[PDB]
Design brief:
The structure is cut from a larger assembly and holds ten protein chains of seven kinds.
Chain E: H1 32-35, H2 52-58, H3 60-75, H4 79-93, H5 105-110, H6 119-122, H7 132-140
Helix pairs in contact in E: 3-4
Chain G: H1 8-16, E1 20-25, E2 28-34, E3 37-39, E4 42-45, E5 52-55, E6 58-64, H2 66-87, H3 93-106, E7 113-121, E8 124-130, E9 136-138, E10 141-144, H4 148-157, H5 165-182, E11 190-196, E12 202-204
Antiparallel strand pairs in G: 1-2, 1-10, 2-11, 3-4, 5-6, 6-7, 7-8, 8-9, 11-12
Helix pairs in contact in G: 2-3, 4-5
Chain H: E1 9-13, E2 18-24, E3 33-35, E4 39-45, H1 47-68, H2 74-87, E5 95-102, E6 109-114, E7 120-122, E8 126-129, H3 135-143, H4 150-166, E9 174-180, E10 185-190
Antiparallel strand pairs in H: 1-2, 1-8, 2-9, 3-4, 4-5, 5-6, 6-7, 9-10
Helix pairs in contact in H: 3-4
The chains are: A alpha+beta, C alpha+beta, E mainly alpha, F alpha+beta, G alpha+beta, H alpha+beta, I alpha+beta.
GO biological process, one term (chain G): proteasomal ubiquitin-independent protein catabolic process
Family (chain G): Belongs to the peptidase T1B family.
Protein name (chain G): Proteasome subunit beta type-2
Amino acid sequence: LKKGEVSLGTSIMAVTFKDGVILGADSRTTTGAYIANRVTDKLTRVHDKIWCCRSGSAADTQAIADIVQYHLELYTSQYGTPSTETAASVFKELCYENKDNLTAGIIVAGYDDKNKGEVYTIPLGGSVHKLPYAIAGSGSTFIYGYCDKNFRENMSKEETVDFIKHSLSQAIKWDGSSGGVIRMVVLTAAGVERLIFYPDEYEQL
Amino acid sequence: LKKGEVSLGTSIMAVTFKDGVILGADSRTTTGAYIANRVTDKLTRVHDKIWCCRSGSAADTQAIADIVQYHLELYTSQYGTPSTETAASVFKELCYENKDNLTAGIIVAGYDDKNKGEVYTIPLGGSVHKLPYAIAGSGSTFIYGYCDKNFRENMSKEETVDFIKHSLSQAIKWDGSSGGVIRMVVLTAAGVERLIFYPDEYEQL
Amino acid sequence: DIILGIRVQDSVILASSKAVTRGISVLKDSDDKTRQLSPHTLMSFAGEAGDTVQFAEYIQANIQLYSIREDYELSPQAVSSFVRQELAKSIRSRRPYQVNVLIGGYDKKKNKPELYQIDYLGTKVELPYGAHGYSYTFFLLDHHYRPDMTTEEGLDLLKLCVQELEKRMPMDFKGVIVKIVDKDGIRQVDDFQ
Amino acid sequence: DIILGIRVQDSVILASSKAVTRGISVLKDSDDKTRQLSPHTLMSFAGEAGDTVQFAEYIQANIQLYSIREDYELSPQAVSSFVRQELAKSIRSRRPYQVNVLIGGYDKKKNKPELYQIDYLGTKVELPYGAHGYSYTFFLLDHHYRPDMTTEEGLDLLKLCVQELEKRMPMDFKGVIVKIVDKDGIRQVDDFQ
Amino acid sequence: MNIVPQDTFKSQVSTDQDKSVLSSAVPSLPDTLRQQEGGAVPLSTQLNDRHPLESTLKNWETTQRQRQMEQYRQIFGIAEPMKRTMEMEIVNRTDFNPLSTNGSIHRDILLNKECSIDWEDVYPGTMVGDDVHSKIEKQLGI
Amino acid sequence: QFNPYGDNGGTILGIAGEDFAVLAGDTRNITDYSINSRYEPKVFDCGDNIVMSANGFAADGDALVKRFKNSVKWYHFDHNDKKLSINSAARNIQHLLYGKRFFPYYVHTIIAGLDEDGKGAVYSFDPVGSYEREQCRAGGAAASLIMPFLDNQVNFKKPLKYLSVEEVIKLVRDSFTSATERHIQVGDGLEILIVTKDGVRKEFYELKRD
Amino acid sequence: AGLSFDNYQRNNFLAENTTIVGVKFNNGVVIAADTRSTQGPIVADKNCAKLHRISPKIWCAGAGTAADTEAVTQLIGSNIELHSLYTSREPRVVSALQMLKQHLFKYQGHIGAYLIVAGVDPTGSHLFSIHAHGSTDVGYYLSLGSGSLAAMAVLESHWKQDLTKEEAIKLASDAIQAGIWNDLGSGSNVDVCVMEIGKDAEYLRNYLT
Amino acid sequence: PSSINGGIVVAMTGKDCVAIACDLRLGSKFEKIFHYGHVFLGITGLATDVTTLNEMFRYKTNLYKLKEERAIEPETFTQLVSSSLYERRFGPYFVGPVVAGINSKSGKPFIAGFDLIGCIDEAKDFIVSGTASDQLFGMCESLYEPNLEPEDLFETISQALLNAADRDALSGWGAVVYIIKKDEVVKRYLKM
Amino acid sequence: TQQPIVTGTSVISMKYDNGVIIAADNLGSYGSLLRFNGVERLIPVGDNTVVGISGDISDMQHIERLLKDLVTENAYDNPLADAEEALEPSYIFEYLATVMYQRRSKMNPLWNAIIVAGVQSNGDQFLRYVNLLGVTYSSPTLATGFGAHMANPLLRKVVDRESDIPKTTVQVAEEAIVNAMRVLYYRDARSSRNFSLAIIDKNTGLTFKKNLQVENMKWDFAKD
Amino acid sequence: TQQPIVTGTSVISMKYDNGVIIAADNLGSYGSLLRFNGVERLIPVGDNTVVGISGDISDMQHIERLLKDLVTENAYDNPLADAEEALEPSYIFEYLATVMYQRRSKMNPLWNAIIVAGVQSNGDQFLRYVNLLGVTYSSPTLATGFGAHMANPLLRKVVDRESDIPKTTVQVAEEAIVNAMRVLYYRDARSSRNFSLAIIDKNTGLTFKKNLQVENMKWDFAKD
C-alpha cells in the first residue's frame, strides 16, 4: 500500500491430510518486473509445529510474524505448546487492530495432539476462516477451479504432496510473479519434514 | 471503456475436437452487482457454421459482429462458403483498426471441409491467435490451470462436452459475473447442434 | 477601460477613458475606444485586447458598406440590432471574450436621441444612461437625471460622475474624452468632461 | 500597509501609512502600526491581520519586562536580535504569515542612530534606508542619500518619496504618520510627512 | 475498415488555408469582411475547445461509405468501387441549384436513402457575398 | 474520505397558539428514492411539557434529543425537581448545538411549549445554535409548499390569536395533505403533538402512500 | 445540418462562472407504465402518458433524457412508416430495433434514451430492451426505470411460460403497482397496451385508477 | 439597468379563457411575453437567448402565415417550439418557455411549458417558470381553482404575483398580465 | 474500516402474529470473487434474540465478539442471569446502535448494516435496523442492501401495516421469506444459493435452520 | 497504440566475424498473466534479413503485414527479384524507421522496439535499432528492454569494440547469446524458457532455430 514498498506476489497453499498438514509455496520475490530474489524462503516458522506464509506488505508481515513468535515464546514459558487456534487468534488480532496502517494476510498451518492438524486463513482486512485447505497470493486465482476438482479429505501424505505440486506448478506456469522452486513443510506427529522440488521436475507434470 | 456502458463479464470457451468444434458460454449479463439478464444468449452466429462470442463493450462488439455478418454475406454471394480464417481476419481488421475508439474481443469457432474445425482468439488490442482451444472472460482466470490439466487433442464429442461443462461450472462457481445456464453449439460435418445445461445439472458435477 | 453614456432630451453624450495598454508607456492624443459608425451614430467599446478593436472595425466596415450601397443612413435601432446579431454570431463557435458597447445616435426620421448598450453575450438594452468598467455612479445618475435635461445639465452630471470616479482612482487615470451626438452630427467637447 | 525608514546622521525617521482594513469605513486619527518598544527604540510593522499586532504587542511586553527588571534599556541591536529570534520561533510549527518590521533606535552608549529591517522569515539586515509595501523609491533613495544628512534633509527626501508614492495611488491613501527617534527620545512630526 | 471516423485533426495551418476568402490587397491574409463570421474569429480558436462528438458526427456517413467501398474492393474488385464513385461524381457534378440546398432524388437513390430520414434532413441549416455569383465563382473555380 | 453525513428527508411544522402549541411532522423515513419506514416518529415529548423535533440527518437528531433528555434528567436531580422553562430549554439546546461548531449536527430543530405566562411558544434553531422564538415555522423538504397554504388560510382571514386547537389541527392536516399531493417525499402519515396546561396529547392521521 | 454544436463553448464558459414493464404471453405482448411525471421532488403531472407508438402495432416506453426519448421514438416512427410504404408490407419489430440500435450507436451514447420496445408483426410477438450506447437485448419479461427492481421482483415471483392475456395483464399491472407503492418516482396510475397476434392493438389509459 | 436576466412567468387556465403574466423591472422596455397573432409565449432565463428565440419565432410564424394563409394554432406552435429547441441539442438556449392561447376552431384553452431542449409539459391547471421565488409554485398551488371566470382568474393570478413579489425583491417590481378569450385580449399593468 | 474487503450481501426479516422471522445467505465475497462459502451471518443472542449483519466480514466478527462479551458480562455475579435477568432485544439494539453512532462520530466506522429481531419478555415483537452512519429505524418488514430494493416490496404485500401483523401466520411469513430469498438469488450477482433462517416465537422459542437451499427454480424457458 | 495490452519482453543481438546473431523468446504476456505461448517474434525477410520486435503484439503483427507487403511489392514485375534486386537490410530498416518516426509525429505511435540484423550484398554486417519515438542507433551488440540492462554487459565483454569483431567466431557469439538468454530467464518475470535464434552468415546464409530451451540451470543451492 505504501509507495515504493516491497509486495508479496506469491503462491501459497496449505492442505490438511490424514496424518497432519502440509504448507507449500514458491520462491520468487519481484520488484515490478525484475526478480529481486529467486530462491527466497517463504515458509515462516513461528513455533516448532506452527508455520505460516505471508502476503501483502513484506515489512508489515515480517513485523507481525516476529511479534507472534515472541508472543508464542511467552505463552510456552507458561502453559507449554500452544494450539494452532491460539496462534491464529494472535495473528488475527494483530492484523485486524492495525488494518488501517498495515497491509497483511497470513495463512497458518499447525499440528497438535488435540486437533491433529489445522489450517487458518486471514485475508486482508483481518477476518479469520478455518478451512480444510487454503490458497492465497496472486497466482492462486488461476488454480481455484483445479483445487476444487482435486481435493479430498483424509488423503495420504504422497497424494497431498502430488496435489500441492500440481497446483503450484500450474500457479507458477500462469503467474508472472511466481516461479523458482517449490518448498513444502510437512507437520505430523512424527515431526517436521522439509521438501524442495526443482523446475525441471514439476514443469514436466 | 465508456462511462455508463454495458460490459461483458462472461465465461467463454471454444474447444476443437475430432469431428469439429464446440463453442460454449454462460448466460449472465450484469450491471455492476445487479443481474440485468439471466437468460441471455451469447452465441453469435455470423455464418451457418461460423459462430463467435464477444467480450468488452456490448455495443461495439454487436456493431462489429453485424458488419462481419454483412461482409460474409457479400463474400458468399461471390465465392460460396467462407473459411474460418477469412472471418477471423475480418474480425481482426475491424478490431485493430478501431482499437483507439472501440473495446472489443472476439472468440471465433468455425468448421469447413478443408480445415475441419478451427478456433481463433482476438483479445483486446486486435492481435489474432490460432489455438486448439481458447478461454475468455472474467471467469476464465479461475480455470486456466484446470483446462491446462484436462485438454487432449482429438477428443470425442461427449468428452469435449464434459470438459466444457466442468470448466464452465467451475467458472460460474467462482466468478460473480457468470451464472445461469450453459449454452453450447457443436459444429461438425453433420450440421449445427445446440445444447443447454441447467444449474441443477452442472452444480452437482 | 471605462465607458459612460447619458441620453439627454436632444442629444447623446458618450465619455470614454483615454487609457493605454499596460506595461508600455504611451503618449498620444486620440480616442482609440470609439468608432464613428455613421455621421449620426457613434459607438464606444470597452473590453479586452484587439478582439474588441477587430469587432468594432468590422462593424464600421459593414455599416459604411450599407450607407454607400443604399445612399441612405440606417437608424440607430437597426444599427444596434445588427451589432447585437454580429456579436452573438462571433461567439457561436469560440470562447467568449470580454466586450461591452454603447451605441449613441440621433434618429432624424423620429428626430430624437437614442442610446443602447450591448454586453459580451449579446444582450441589447435601451437605457437613458449607462456605464461599464466601474466597480456607485448608478445612484448619482438616478438621483440627478431627468428625461427633459438639456445638454448642459447632462454635461454637468457627467462631470460629477467623472469626479466621483476619479476620487477613487490613481493619477494614472489621465482623463476622459467626451463626444456629443445630436441633430448636427458628432462633435468633440475639447474643453472638459 | 506600507512602511518606510531613513537613518540620518543623528536620528532615525520612520513613516507609516495610516491605512485601514477593507470593507469597513473608519474615521480615526492614530498610528496603529507602530509600537514604542523603549523610550529610544521604536518599531513599525506591516503585513496581514491581527497576527502582526499580536506579535508586536508580545515584543513590547517582553521588552518592557526587561526594562523594569534590569532598570536599564536594551540597545537597538539587542532589541533587533531578540525580535528576530522571536519571529523565527513563531513560525517553527505553523504556516508563515506575512510580516515585515523596521526597528529604529538611538544607541546612547555609542551615541548614534541605528535602523534594522526584519522580513517574514526572520532575516535581519542593517540598512541606511528601507521600505516595504511598495510595488521606484529605491532609485530616489540611492541618488539622494548621504550618510551625513541632517534631519531636515532626511525629511525632504521622505517628502519626495511620499509624493512619488502618492502619484500612483488613489485618493483613498489618506496620508503617512512620521516619527523621529533621536537622543531626546521619540517625537511625532505633527506638521506633515 | 473504419467504424468511428479517424484522422480528423488538422496537421498544418496557414493564413491562406481558405482559398475562397483570400484578401485581394494582401493575398497571404484572409478577407475578414467577406468571411461574415462576426469579425473576431481567428483560425487558431477553431483548433481548441471543440465538442468531442462533432468530428465523429460530421464525418460519419463518409466513413461508412469508405468502409463499404473498401469491402467492395476486397470482395468484388476495383471495378465496383470505381463504378460507384463514378456514378456519384456524375450525379453530384451536374447538379447546380444556387437557390436550393436539398439533395437530389437520384443521389438518395444511389445512397439507398429513398425512405430514410436523419436529423440532417430535418434540420438542413447576409450583408456581403451570399448571392448567385459567389456560388457561380466557387462552382466554376474562377 | 468517509462521508459521515446522510439525509432522511422529512417535514415538520410548529405553530404557537394563544394558550397552546402544536408540533407536527410526517412519519415517512426514506433513503434516496427508497422507503425505510412509513411510521417513524420525529416529534418527541421531552418532559416538563416540551415537545422537540430535529429534522434532517436522523442519527444526529436522535443523538441531540437523547443528550437533551439526559441533561433534563440531571437538571431535575440538581435543582429540587424544578420545572425547566421553554427559554431555558432553548438556551440548553443552543449550547448543545454550538458544542459541535466544527463538526455540526446536520439537523434543523424546532421546540414548542408554554411560556411563563401560559402562552404558546415555538423556538427554531439553525444547525449551529442560532435560535429565535416564532409564531409559526415549517422545515424540511415541503416547507415552501406548507407555508403559503397557512399564509393564505390564516392572518398572522381569522387571526391566529382567536383560533382554537381543533381549527389549528385542521389547518395542519389540510396543509400536509396538499403537500403530500404535490411532494414525492411527503406522505404515509402525519403525527401532531399538542401542548396545553393539561399536558401533551398525540394525534395521528393517514396520508397518501404512493 | 443536423443537431447543432453552436454555443457549446459559450455554455461551458457560463458553467465555469418511473416504472416500465414488458411481458410476453402465449399469443402476444403487453407493455405497461406508471403516469407520474416529476421535475425533481415536485410532482409535475399526476396523469402522464409514457407509452409511445412507433407504429400501430409496435409500441415503446423510455427513460433517461425525456426529450431524447421522444425525439428518437418519433424519428424511428417516421422511418418505419416510410419503409412500410416503400415495401408495401407491415413493419417488423426487428427493423425498428435495427434502426434504433444503429442510430444510438452513431451518437456514441450522447443521446440518453433507454427503451423497452414491444410489438407484433407477421413473424410473431417481440420484446426488446435498448441501451443508450447501442446495445440491445431480448427477453420474455423486462423492467426499466427507478422502480424497476420492485417490478422485476414481482415479475420473477409470478411469471410462467403458459400465460393467457388476462394473466399477463394482471402480472404487468401488479408489477407497475409494486413500483408505484415502493418507489418515490412512481405512484399515480397504470397505463397498459396489449398487442395480440392477428388483432388490433388495445391501448388502455388508466387501467387501474 | 442592463441586468434583465431571470424573471418569472405564470400561465393559468380558466373557463373559456387563459391568463399569462410576467414580472417587469423598474423605471428610470424589456418584456418577456410576446404574441404571434393569438398565441402567447413567455420566456424566462438568459436575456440574449430570449431575444433570439423571439426573433426566430417571429420569422417562422410570419413564413407560416404566408404559406398556410392562416394563423398558427397553439398546439402547432407548441410542436414548432419543441422541434426548434431540440435542434440545439448540444448547445441549448438557457431558457424556460411557456405557451398560452385559445384554439380558434374548438375554443379550448391551452397552456404548455418546455425544458431547455424542448420536452413538452402540457398542464391542465397552471405553469410556473423561473427561479426567482421558490414559494411562487406553492402560492399558485394554494390559490388556483379550476374553471374560473376571467375576472376571478385575473384576480387570482394578480394576487399570486403580488404575494410572490412581497416576500422577494421590491422597490420597482411590476407585472404585465394578459387575459385571453376566444375573441378578446386584455393587457394590464400592475405597479403594486 | 475505511474500505470493505470481504463482504456479505443482504439480510431480510419480517414480523408475523406471534413472532419474527429473519434470514441471510452464507457467502463471503472478495469483490467479484465468491471466495468464502460457509459464513454464518445470523448470530443468536440469548434464547430470544437474533442479529443479522451485512457488510464487512472482519467488522462482523468484531461485533460477534462484542455480543459474546455482552452475554458473558450479563451473567457476571448474576444468579438469575437466565431466568429474569436475561438480555432483551431492546438492550442489545441500544448497545449496538450506541456503538455504531460513536464509531461514526470518530471517523472510524464499522462498515455494516445490522438488523436486530426478537421477542420481548412481555411477548412484544422487536425488529429494528441500524447502519454504519448510526441511522436507526423500525418497520414490520426490514431488509439491507439489494433486499431493501427487492425483498421489501414482496414482504409488504403480506404485511403492509400494523393491523396486518395479527392476520399473518408463521407459515405465510416463512413462505414469503423463502420466495424473497429465491428472487435475491435470481437477481443478485454476489448472492449464494445456501442460506440460514431463524424464527423467534413467543410460544415455541428460537428455531434456527441452517443449510437451507433455494429450490423450485424456473430454468426452463431459456431453451428458446 | 496509446496503451500496450499483449507484449513480448526483449530481443538480443550481436555481430561476429562473418555475420550476425539475433534471438528472442516466444512469450506474449497479458500483464502479469503469461497468456500466449508460441509467439514468433523473429521475422525473416528475404534470404538475408531478420527483424526482431519487442512490445505490443498487435502492432508487431501489423509490422509483419507491412514487411510481407514490402517483399511482394519488391517482387512485382521484377524478373531478377531474387538474384540482384532482392531487398537489403538497409532498405528494410530505412522504411521501418521512416514509418516509426512518421507515426510518432502523428501522436499515433507503434509501441515497439525493433532490431534489424543481416548481411549486405557486399558482405558487410548490418545491425541497427529503432523504437516508438523514432530513435535509431547502431552498435556491435544490441538489445531491447530488460536485455539492454543485462544482456549488453555480457555481450560487450566478448565484442567491446569494432576491432573485436574479426576476432569473434560464430561459436563464441552463439554461446554468449545463449548465456544471456539464460540470465534473462533467471531475472525477468515476463520471460519464457522457450526462445528462437537466427544466424545470418555471408557464407552459409540464414539458419533459423526454433524451439530452443534454456538448459543447465543452477537450481541446486536453494536447499539451504
